[PDB]
């Protein structure tokens, strides 16, 4: 009986403010308990052994790499690092639910997605060292990864800027009849940025095949969520934009996989956004765990044991150390590369600046650390 274009609603004849439900919020979806036991048989994805072992080995290999590169940072061998501790389950559980060619936008804390997609150890290292093997040409801070082959858009420091971008790539995919979905990861702190409000609204009104994947680890650097928002986390925001939303246990690789798998299926079929808020806890910020929960599961199915755990711990340390040795011995790229790719074609005036550097180094090069730069 109300006729207003802005909303579809009835009249009410008494004044009643709508109260938020924060104390009893959106419940947390969980598939396996802390002992790795399946709680509800109808929800078990019954992933095959080789796939569940890949989830496990990807998480642990990431953890092995993290320990070594974190030490490398402490010694000043690389200028920065930040670990994935506690996030390994959200990474690998969601990546396993995607198509290989689904495009990923991330925030900075999803090396496990690249790991699941078989990104070489040499290439994680090359970016952290800024060596000649880095396809990023040593230009970004360490732990800024990207891979065009594996459909993983280069990560950038400014928080949340990837969120409206991811929506545009999803709109483009829709037009291309891609049958592809975009996933976009961000933390609960980044969800406070204006660009998150932009991306969430655009994806709904432009009907885009996108999964918004918020990792809520309770902290943004020193800021607890009590200072970050006052509604019921990020999941409760989704319905206000018209977005189907769910909250999952981010320490449960199966809950993450199931929610991501179903979000992907429906996003691609229906051209509509889905929001998944995965609850974790930031175990490490920069320079009841998903791995142990999955280990307990494996040890039930009879698919892992102490002998295997020992051998894999050895093999993964050896692979990480081989990559690390190679990364440290590679030279850095030619200093000329600081000038290319600013535009596709270097402007004549930028070429002039390049030439001026080359002249400068001719005369003053003894003063520059040219030892381990290429050419």
């Amino acid at each position: 009986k109300p006729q207003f274009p802005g909303a579809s609603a009835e009249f009410i004849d008494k004044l009643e403010f709508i109260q938020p439900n924060v104390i009893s919020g959106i419940p947390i979806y969980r598939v396996m308990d802390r002992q790795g036991q399946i709680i509800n048989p109808s929800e078990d994805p019954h992933l095959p052994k080789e796939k569940v072992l890949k989830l496990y080995k990807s998480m642990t290999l990431l953890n092995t790499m993290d320990r070594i590169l974190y030490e490398s940072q402490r010694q000043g061998r690389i200028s920065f690092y930040m670990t994935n501790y506690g996030e390994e389950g959200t990474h690998v559980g969601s990546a396993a639910a995607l198509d290989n060619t689904d495009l990923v936008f991330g925030a900075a804390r999803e090396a496990g997605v690249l790991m699941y997609r078989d990104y070489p150890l040499e290439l994680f290292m090359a970016q952290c060292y800024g060596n000649i093997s880095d396809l990023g040409k040593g230009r970004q801070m360490p732990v800024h990864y990207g891979c065009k082959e594996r459909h993983f858009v280069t990560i950038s420091s400014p928080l949340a800027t990837q969120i409206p971008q991811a929506v545009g790539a999803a709109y483009a995919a829709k037009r291309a009849n891609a049958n592809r979905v975009v996933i976009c990861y961000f933390g609960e702190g980044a969800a406070s940025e204006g660009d998150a409000h932009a991306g969430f609204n655009f994806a709904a009104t432009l009907e885009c095949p996108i999964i918004f994947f918020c990792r809520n680890n309770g902290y943004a650097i020193s800021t607890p969520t009590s200072e970050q928002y006052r509604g019921d986390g990020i999941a409760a925001r989704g319905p206000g934009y018209g977005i189907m939303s769910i909250r999952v246990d981010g320490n449960d690789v199966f809950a993450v996989y199931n929610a991501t798998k179903e979000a992907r299926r429906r996003a691609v079929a229906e051209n509509q956004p889905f929001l998944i808020e995965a609850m974790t806890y930031r175990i490490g910020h920069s320079t009841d765990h998903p791995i142990s929960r999955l280990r307990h599961y494996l040890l039930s199915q009879g698919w892992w044991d102490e002998e295997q755990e020992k051998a894999w711990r050895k093999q993964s340390r050896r692979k990480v150390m081989e990559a690390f040795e190679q990364a440290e011995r590679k030279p850095k790229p030619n200093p000329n590369l600081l000038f290319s790719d600013v535009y596709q074609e270097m402007p004549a005036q930028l070429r002039k600046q390049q030439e001026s550097l080359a002249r400068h180094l001719q005369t003053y090069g003894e003063h520059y650390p040219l030892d381990h730069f290429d050419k």
Partner: protein, 329 residues
């Protein structure tokens, strides 16, 4: 020289560029606030009916979203032509332009880019626009390596420069002088053609002084050249810069080596304005040829006023007086 032409005003020339782009590039889409019905300056009239609602469409009212979304379309390789409704309102998107679009190719080692993005926006004074309908923000963007900024002076120039921006493999901001949208028409080819970026145009040869401007202010300096000839017997070389970055240093310096005197004019405020970059560069390259200090005749260092507009703008009398003093230096 370019096939059949019609008289077009500058809004019509922008529609013509956009129509030609849609026709020949099936990936291209146009989006922004109120573009579906044809836009608040009529630049997108007819395009949605012609090309489809999926290709010419309205966004929510959120400039940071508009640019971020356009970047995302371009990351997939599709041509993204975003509109910002007035250049005064581009600032919410400044972080997506400067920290994201401009740095996208460099920071990925060319694994990803957003070269197929163009942002177009009405620009410059309009008689009564006051603080937020009048701005010319080009100097803010000029200090950002990785983007191109382009400003036409006429309908013919607009269509040819806009087609070049849309086709250029770098994110481009195309500023359309709004006070020219319904001003005098001129003949514009119906089919596509391009005018090169980073190329100034000498529109009148002269031997005593070089005058440089862009957008509407080109017409002001053309009139100043006439006043100078008639009143002072002074020969002015009149140059339209066209591309603010990367700019055509060689055309400007070659002219100043010849004349020995340079006056640059723009509606934007003096301090930090783009005349500051042209003057300091010409000074470095043409020092020994300079007969008089390089003059900058610009808006005052204030916000852009409503009732005082006629007193604020660097009009032909302000430019002429500056020129007179420079000739007499």
């Amino acid at each position: 020289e370019y096939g059949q032409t019609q008289k077009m005003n500058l809004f019509q020339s922008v529609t013509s560029a956009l129509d030609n782009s849609l026709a020949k590039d099936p990936t291209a889409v146009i989006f922004g606030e109120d573009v579906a019905f044809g836009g608040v300056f009529r630049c997108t009239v007819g395009l949605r009916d012609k090309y489809g609602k999926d290709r010419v469409f309205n966004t929510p009212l959120c400039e940071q979203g508009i640019v971020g979304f356009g970047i995302g379309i371009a990351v997939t390789g599709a041509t993204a032509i975003a509109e910002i409704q007035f250049a005064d309102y581009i600032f919410p998107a400044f972080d997506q332009i400067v920290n994201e679009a401009a740095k996208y190719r460099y920071r990925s080692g060319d694994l990803f880019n957003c070269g197929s993005l163009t942002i177009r926006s009405p620009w410059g004074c309009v008689g009564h626009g006051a603080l937020y309908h009048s701005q010319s923000p080009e100097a803010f963007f000029a200090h950002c390596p990785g983007i191109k900024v382009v400003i036409p002076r006429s309908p013919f120039q607009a269509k040819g420069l806009l087609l070049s921006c849309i086709e250029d493999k770098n994110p481009c901001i195309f500023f359309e002088p709004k006070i020219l949208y319904r001003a005098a028409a001129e003949e514009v080819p119906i089919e596509p053609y391009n005018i090169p970026l980073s190329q100034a145009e000498v529109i009148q040869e002269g031997s005593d002084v070089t005058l440089v401007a862009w957008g509407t202010q080109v017409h002001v300096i053309r009139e100043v050249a006439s006043m100078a000839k008639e009143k002072l017997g002074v020969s002015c070389e009149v140059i339209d810069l066209r591309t603010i970055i990367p700019w055509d240093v060689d055309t400007i310096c070659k002219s100043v080596i010849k004349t020995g005197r340079l006056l640059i004019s723009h509606e934007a405020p003096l301090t930090g304005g783009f005349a500051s970059e042209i003057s300091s560069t010409v000074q470095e390259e043409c020092f020994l040829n300079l007969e008089a200090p390089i003059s900058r005749v610009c808006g005052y260092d204030t916000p852009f006023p409503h009732i005082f507009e006629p007193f604020y703008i660097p009009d032909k009398w302000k430019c002429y007086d500056a020129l007179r003093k420079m000739i007499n230096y």
